[PDB]
Design a protein around this ligand. Sequence first.
Ligand SMILES: Nc1cccc2c1C(=O)N([C@H]1CCC(=O)NC1=O)C2=O
Ligand SMILES: [Zn+2]
Ligand SMILES: [Zn+2]
Lengths: 25, 1089, 338
Amino acid sequence: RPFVCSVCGHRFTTKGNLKVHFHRH
Amino acid sequence: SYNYVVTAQKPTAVNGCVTGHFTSAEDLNLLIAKNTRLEIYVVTALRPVKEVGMYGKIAVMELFRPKGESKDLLFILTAKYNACILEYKQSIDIITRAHGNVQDRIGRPSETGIIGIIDPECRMIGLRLYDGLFKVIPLDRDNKELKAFNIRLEELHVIDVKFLYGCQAPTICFVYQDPQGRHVKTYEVSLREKEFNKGPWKQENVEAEASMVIAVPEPFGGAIIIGQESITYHNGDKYLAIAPPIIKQSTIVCHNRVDPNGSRYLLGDMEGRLFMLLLEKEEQMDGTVTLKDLRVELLGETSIAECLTYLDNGVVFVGSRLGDSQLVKLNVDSNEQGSYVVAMETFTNLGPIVDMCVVDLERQGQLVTCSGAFKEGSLRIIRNGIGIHEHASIDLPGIKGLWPLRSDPNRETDDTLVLSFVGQTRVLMLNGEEVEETELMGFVDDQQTFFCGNVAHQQLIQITSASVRLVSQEPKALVSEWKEPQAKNISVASCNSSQVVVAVGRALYYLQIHPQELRQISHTEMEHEVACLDITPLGLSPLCAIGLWTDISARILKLPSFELHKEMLGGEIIPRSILMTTFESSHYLLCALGDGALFYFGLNIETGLLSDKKVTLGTQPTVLRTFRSLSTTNVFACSDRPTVIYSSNHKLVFSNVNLKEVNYMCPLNSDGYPDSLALANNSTLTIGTIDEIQKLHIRTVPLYESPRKICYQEVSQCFGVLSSRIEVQDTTTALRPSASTQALSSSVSSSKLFEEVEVHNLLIIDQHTFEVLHAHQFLQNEYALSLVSCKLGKDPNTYFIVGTAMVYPEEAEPKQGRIVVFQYSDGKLQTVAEKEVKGAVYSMVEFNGKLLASINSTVRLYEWTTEKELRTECNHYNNIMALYLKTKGDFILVGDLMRSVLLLAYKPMEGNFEEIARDFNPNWMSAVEILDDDNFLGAENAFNLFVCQKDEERQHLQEVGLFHLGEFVNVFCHGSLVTQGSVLFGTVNGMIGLVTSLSESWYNLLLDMQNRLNKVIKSVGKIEHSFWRSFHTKTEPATGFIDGDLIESFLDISRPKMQEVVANLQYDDKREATADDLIKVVEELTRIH
Amino acid sequence: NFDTSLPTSHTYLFHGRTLHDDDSCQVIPVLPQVMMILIPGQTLPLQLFHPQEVSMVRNLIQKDRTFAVLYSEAQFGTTAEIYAYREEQDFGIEIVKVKAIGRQRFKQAKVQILPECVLPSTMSAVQLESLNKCQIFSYKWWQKYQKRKFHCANLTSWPRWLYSLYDAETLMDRIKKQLREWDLPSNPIDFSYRVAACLPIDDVLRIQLLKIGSAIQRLRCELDIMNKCTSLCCKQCQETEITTKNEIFSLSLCGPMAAYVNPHGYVHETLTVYKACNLNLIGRPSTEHSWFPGYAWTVAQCKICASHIGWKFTATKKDMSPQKFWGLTRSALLPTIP
Ligand SMILES: Nc1cccc2c1C(=O)N([C@H]1CCC(=O)NC1=O)C2=O
Ligand SMILES: [Zn+2]
Ligand SMILES: [Zn+2]
């Protein structure tokens, strides 16, 4: 899981899943 | 908004006192400083000499004599750092030898305040102003600018500092405090190097609470250290320390040296004790002596001392701020009794005016103030008028008339006073001050007398209701008698040196006074029964003034023809007295009605034509009489409120007399009462002199506790006074019997809700006697905060309402309080309703039948129900502490100690408050008031006044007024002692002032008037009036205010300075204004207080 | 316990002497993408990546070394002065890391310094000259203090205990006891600013104290919040209690709250508490770039709304004190009066 959010540290596997969480910031 | 301030009473508390030789090297002076004032006395076995007003708050007052000078010079430093050196010159002026502003740009003011000390050789002046700096002023003869240099003080927190006696160079000795405790240190001050050099000695672990340094003179040298327990002396390596028990009760706060050898000192307590510290010497084996021990003897108790000074003949001046200042005599401890103190004189000090109120008591309203603190607490009644010094009283009620009489024809001096009554007449004789009623051979004593006295041809006269009698001086006997041909009664009589115009009902007759005969001349009818007469010549009178009962008019009749000029009065009420007299240059006539009016007209004694003006003087009938004061005769108008009538600048002025009701008066120049007046009222005859001017009169009511709030309740004719006395822990143990303990009837709270100690009471004080009629003591640890008298709801009773706050030491912010509604009926005060409250009731004001009480940060509006209770209908919360409450109609002014103000309004259709405006300018604020619906007055930090105006985002207030007053204002209240509106204010320094609103046409006039007076008037320390009145803390020039004390000094400068001011002035009615235009204008401003 | 000085030294990542005199007009840089309300004396770590910024700082070293931090857009702000700086080019990524500290409040930005309004005591106006000599002096000491310092209240129309409620020295002590409660400066100005940054409030309340110019009104209003804000809830869903005052403790030397950067340069004012309820923990505890050396952080989010409230920290040694604590970012919280 190398894709991490830039605010909290939440990790994901795909680049698209990270874009889902970051939109909540 | 443009307002106008003026000092209504100069400050009374003493900032500091010092003796010396100032007026002449041969005199001994006592110089007293009271804030912005300086008194100069000359000691006798105290004679005033010169009072001056500076443009500063006197902070440092010290005398000194430079080398090779005639007399001592005075150094003064104001709180705005204005330094000046002054000299006395003999009509009398005080000149400035050297002046300058010693203020620094950077620097923090020190926590112990300004300290100014001068070395014994007058080389330099040392000033402590800021932490870490010491400013030295070389006293060179060529230092007219007071130039000064600073030195680095690594000792930052200094307590006290003096110069040491007997040193090879100027040396200071100061007590400071660092984390390592307290110490005492000495420094050698280098005039040349301009630095510090290590002093002759220093010490460690100086006592814990050392606060006062005294410099012992040349005999011994060194210094003294005063503390809470120990008194310690230092000198080089010499050391003495005593901890006497007679001082452990309180703190020494002021000292003063008695003798130049330093053997005896005077120490002042904080609780008023007076001690004498005595050095004791010891003979040495090679000449001069050596100090051996120190003694302290309690001389007694004086007023709470602030400064102390010893006048040569064993008489001490006790300069006080919380109480009256004193001249006290000390008796050396003698075989007969232990050293004790007795006061000779007492000087009035209005003290720290905590609260006050204006009251119309004699029905001009006088001012009653809460003054002082602790045993010096008191009430002060302040009435304005011409006071009368009484000299004798006689108990004779129902006096209907009063006349002087000269029984001895060879003696100019009077010796007889004739008194009329109903169907009776009494003749009194005067030998010195012994009065005795006797008969006058020829006078009848069974009829009311309407006139009597000395007439021409060496004779007397008496006009009773039945006859006009003429008595001879030499062998007193009747010579001629006029009686009405039909045996009718004389109704109104008037007589002078030669003429007699009596009047029976409608008709009146004109008589002349000749040797041994009273020849009638004129028989004339009138349209309506006559009511008053006057026949005063301006030696014979060619005219006669009359008034008609049904006509209601004042007429002028030529004598002896009785032919009418005339003017008409109008009304349904008859005249009671009329008089023709002369004021200033022009002639006049005065007529007074039964309703109290007083018409006055300009008379032409040739053409008989009267012209013009009328004014009311009470609601009871008025009787006019003429007396002589100085070389110009005035008119005394007896009535409900008597009044002296004079003319300044050709305008009739009415200054009231400081007396209860007066019915009849007459001047009297007897042997025992020369140049005096005989006043008569409903009960008593009084004889005494009369002051020439209208002055402030202060009655003192000692309370011996601290009064804090006061209101008036007219329906009970008494005052409600909040007060607090101090009691010891005991085991109910007071320190001294006070007003709360010497009441006629005492009650205790006993409620249902919920080392020294403060005990709060509500004092019920009679308005006439100022007895302590009742004293309700509140609960334990309950602090009474606000007090108001008012009627609530539909309840017709007037209630005393008190707002309190449970003050426990453990609770920082108070969390519970009361709103107690008292009722005073009969002789007793009854608790009518409580109301528990979760906070402090800081302020209460009546609000249109409801009670507006502030509670911590909340403003509550209670209602008064038929169940006789307090019901809550509204509430409002704020981000500030509702300390101040002032209202008008539906506006509400709210403020806290942080100068942040809020403006609320009760919106009735919503049962709710709306915030109208708001202004937050953080500073310390002491009192507020509402001038009108648009303007609000307040006092903020550094002795200033400010005004905030109202005129959407205009919910922010404009700062329209700023003014440096020089006084700490505690209370604002509306009223005056008889320009728009009137607002008085009290002061910590005892100063009383007045604010009144002006029109813009006048503000710019008096503004340009001020800019002109400053160019002319010579200031004491040459302090620019703009800088003295400049807003200070930030620092801005004043605006919106006019210095009335400046405008009123226009009448003190010489006549050339007056034109000089009015040189290029455009006046109002637009012409090059003249000095007389401004004299009559400035004088009109002196009559608002 | 643990080294309370470690968090304030920002281990996971210069004699400052330039001050601008009061009311001056200065032109100062404002950093892009920085959003926070900064308090005089508060510490601010930063991590900058754009060459724009990296240029601004490299040249900012010259002269002032001070930039402006600003939002409701913005009427006021605070100058921040860089006291430490490293230029790291590791992994071939050029990063500039700086630690600034807030200095002055103001109203490239054209900027007017707001003066700190300092007033004397309530008594400095009414103080008897004879008692000037006495103005310099375990809780009765405060009754003595009150009696002697405010003695001249008797000259005015209010009691000693009122003037006490506006006395900086007294107020600071009243604040101290609460600050002691879960274990400072002597200058009231400094004290009020130190606890301003400690107080977990929301962006709109932080602007209130910033607008306040006087220490007295700052300390007073600060005492109100400390009594009135017992509970702390999730800002997003409002009605969900995360922790209480009881649980707040100062793990960092500066206080229970300081500003911390994550690796991407986002600033988090996180509040250290012992207990925290209604949070879910996701992912695995990790020490990578942990602001508390010795502890691993796990992402915590509100049980109800899933909005990221902060982090749970766990010890890595079984001998460490405060074995578990929660760190809550200030922007995610809402003080409540229950
Ligand atoms: N390594 C990453 C990567 C992305 C985001 C974060 C971190 C990270 O460490 N923190 C916080 C977690 C909490 C902490 O103690 N220190 C941090 O830097 C983040 O927000
Ligand atoms: Zn995230
Ligand atoms: Zn939530």
